Amino acid sequence: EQATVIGLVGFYFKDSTFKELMFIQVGEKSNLMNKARINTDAQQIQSIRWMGNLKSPQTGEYRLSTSSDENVILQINGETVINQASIQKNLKLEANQVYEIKIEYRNTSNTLPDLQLFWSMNKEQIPEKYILSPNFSEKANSLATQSFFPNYNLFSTPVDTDNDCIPDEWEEKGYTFRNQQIVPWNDAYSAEGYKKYVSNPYHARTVKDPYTDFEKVTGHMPAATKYEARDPLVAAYPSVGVGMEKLHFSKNDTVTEGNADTKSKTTTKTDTTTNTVEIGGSLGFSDKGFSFSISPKYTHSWSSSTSVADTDSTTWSSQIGINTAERAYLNANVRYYNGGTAPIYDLKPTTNFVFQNSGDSITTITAGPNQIGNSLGAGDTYPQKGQAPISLDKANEAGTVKIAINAEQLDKIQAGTEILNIETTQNRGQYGILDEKGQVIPGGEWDPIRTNIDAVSGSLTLNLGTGKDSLERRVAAKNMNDPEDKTPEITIKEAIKKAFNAYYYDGRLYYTDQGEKDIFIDEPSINLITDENTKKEIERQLNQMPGKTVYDVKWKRGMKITLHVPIKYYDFETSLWYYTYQESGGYTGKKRGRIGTDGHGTAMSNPQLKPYTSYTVRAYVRTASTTGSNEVVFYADNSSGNGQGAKVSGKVTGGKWKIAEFSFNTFNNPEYFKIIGLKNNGNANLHFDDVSVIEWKTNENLQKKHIFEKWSFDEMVIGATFTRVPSSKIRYQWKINGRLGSIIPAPPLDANGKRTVTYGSITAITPMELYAVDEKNDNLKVKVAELGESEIEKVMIDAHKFSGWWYLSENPNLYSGLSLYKLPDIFYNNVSSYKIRVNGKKVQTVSKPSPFLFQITFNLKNPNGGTYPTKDASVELWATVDLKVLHKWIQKSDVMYSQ
Ligand SMILES: [Ca+2]
Ligand SMILES: [Ca+2]
Ligand SMILES: [Ca+2]
């Protein structure tokens, strides 16, 4: 905390009559004019007004003197004290009481040498300690206080309607803040890094936040404020939230990490807006070159969703040994972040852990300035960056807290069907202000200031990475109901730029962070996400502008946009893709990959795809001639875009720049989408640039979670029984020997956790495959059970058991029939005939015997010649689908029957 800003603000005019402002030097403190010599314009000044406040140290009497009292008029509280050294005029001042200062200073010829300020109680020189800043909040929007730009001047003058001491014509035309002074902005300064500020010449607080435009653009704010918030247009505004790092869960109410019966799982905060985008159906080659994304559940980033990885081998309810009706105590480790731009002070957030889809609460905690800090800085975090995360019981003011859920919900959380959201309340806190000395002092409730800022601005969120701290920004916009507001109007690009303190690089906006891994955020490089209302306002605007990019639309009060960073991004511009030429051009950037008339470019090192995530791939294409019609394909395939994967067949190219986009769910086969690539085949060349790849949320591994057991099979049905299933609503679908049955819903588990899926119109056991179908999407299957012809072969062969032999009443050493048990009809209609060889002789073929209920029988008189078998014959039996079914020797030991 430097506090160099505290002091006399001074207005340096070039002429002798306070009329052509040149610069506004802040924070002068005793040796006047000296701080301002850093301006190359300083020795050309002939009139200077200072304004500020003087602290009177001890009670008593002071005589006030200067260097060139000849050319100084000095009022304090309006009363003239020096007037070209025509009075010595004594002043009785009280101790610890402050007084307004107005110094004017003029020389009809000669530049002014520096100016000095002197004490006395009987000389001396005024310590910088007792020289303070003009009270900015109350010289703001009042009358009959005295003005910063008064026309009289006391020996055509600037107007400043606000009294935030930024002239009207400056707030409109543009200014900046270079060398701790405010100067009118000329475009040179942009190459030095200076930003072009504009603001409202009629409100002192354009974006309605605690500091006047001047305090913001200068520095009269807390030191922990993001540089962003110096722009009159982006607000000082906090975003305190809390993400979860570890989730522990015990069988007993003593859920503390490091303990018997206390399992501990790791977790990661993820922005909820993006994790609730439902992919859609894919756009593939269309004009009006922009994509877009809508979230239903658009969530401000002070409200984290929590991600869990189901690496685990076994359900967590089994991991601790609790059953259906026993409860599972649990506890967690968390970290508080401030995604905002302003430090919040004396905070007290109460925080709600909820289920995403059935908005049920789990628990609540309230944290005090004793449990977390006195304050939370902008972009800071408690516990700090290198530190371990504090525990729920260490966070909650009221100590530990019983948190119990059942086995059902606890395994749904592992499986990811219940996402665990952490909404945390914004109302309690305090903004900082600069005092007399230059250290933060709590200055007021944040709650009314937040409602006022939100009223007058839009909402911009940079969600970089599913584990990294987001940025919550608010940028003012016009008041559309007022046909006279002078809040400056800016496009989306200008707002994104201002919101994130982003810089240019070949016209390419880009965001540089503290981990210094810079990111391109111009429209083709990121992925935008809005709610429903902003979609309409954007699309309403882009029907009236034929050069249509989202970044061009006028930025309107009440919008909500989220920037989402791609996971692979090919901007053809460096030192890449196979069979493609770098060349020179580009949608954005400098170069712009191209392929030929059969040209078949693919990607060197394309992205890492996950087993049940869904992705979006976007590209920018043109023809490289006028009209030269060619036919493109854009794919994410394992065979150049010929099945298993995702192609978009591009029937439309001629001339200008167009988007081409497709989305897919890698659904138990990420490998099917290994390679991104463009095939061209037509009249002209093919240009393209800015290929991007966007990641959208993993789902439950349907195949992994199914576990199989047994095959079931008078009763006329086939059924597949599962011990474990996934916890998601799914469907099933049979493949009966190539043909695919209707999609059917999941049957309900009964008793045990057993689900069994079945097939009805079955007459003879045939090879079958059971597919698990996605809940909503009919084209997302996965095999979960299969019945193959070598298994059926085994079932047929076992379904033939031996009932007994048939001897004769009339001679009981002669046998006459072999009988098996009747087969069940689902099996028997699968045999067509039998073959029987008795006494190794001729292999007779006989038709399917008609069961005489309880057992089928073949006779032996005739495959054995005419002799009723031999007491020791060999009987062999086949049944064709041929399949040896029994091979047996007639023994006196076996079951026998007679007639
Ligand atoms: Ca002003
Ligand atoms: Ca203003
Ligand atoms: Ca480029």
Numbering used by the authors: 10 to 131, 135 to 156, 160 to 170, 183 to 602, 605 to 742, 746 to 913, 917 to 934
According to the publication:
The structure of Vpb4Da2 was solved by X-ray crystallography to 3.2 Å resolution in the space group C2221 with one molecule in the asymmetric unit. Domain 1 (amino acids 1–263), which encompasses a characteristic PA14 domain, adopts a conformation of ten anti-parallel β-strands, six small α-helices, and binds two adjacent calcium ions visible in the structure. Domain 2 (amino acids 264–483) consists of a β-hairpin motif, seven anti-parallel β-strands, a partially structured long loop, and three additional α-helices. Domain 4 (amino acids 594–730) consists of β-strands exhibiting a classical β-jelly roll fold and harboring a calcium ion. Domain 5 (amino acids 731–820) has an immunoglobulin-like fold of six β-strands and one α-helix. Vpb4Da2 exhibits an overall β-strand-rich structure and shares structural homology to PA, namely the domain conformation and organization spanning approximately the first 600 amino acids that include domains 1–3. Furthermore, unlike the PA domain 4 described as a receptor binding domain with an immunoglobulin-like fold, Vpb4Da2 domain 4 adopts a fold of the carbohydrate binding module 6 (CBM6), which is also found in domain 3 of many three-domain Cry proteins.
In the current study we determined the crystal structure and mode of action (MOA) of the Vpb4Da2 protein (formerly known as Vip4Da2) from Bt, the first identified insecticidal Vpb4 protein with commercial level control against WCR. Amino acid sequence analysis designates Vpb4Da2 as a new β-PFP member of the Bacterial_exotoxin_B protein family (IPR035088) with Vpb4Da2 domain architecture composed of PA14 (PF07691) and Binary-toxB (PF03495) protein family (Pfam) domains. The Vpb4Da2 structure exhibits a six-domain architecture mainly comprised of antiparallel β-sheets organized into β-sandwich layers. Functional assessment of Vpb4Da2 suggests that domains 4–6 comprise the WCR receptor binding region and are key in conferring the observed insecticidal activity against WCR.
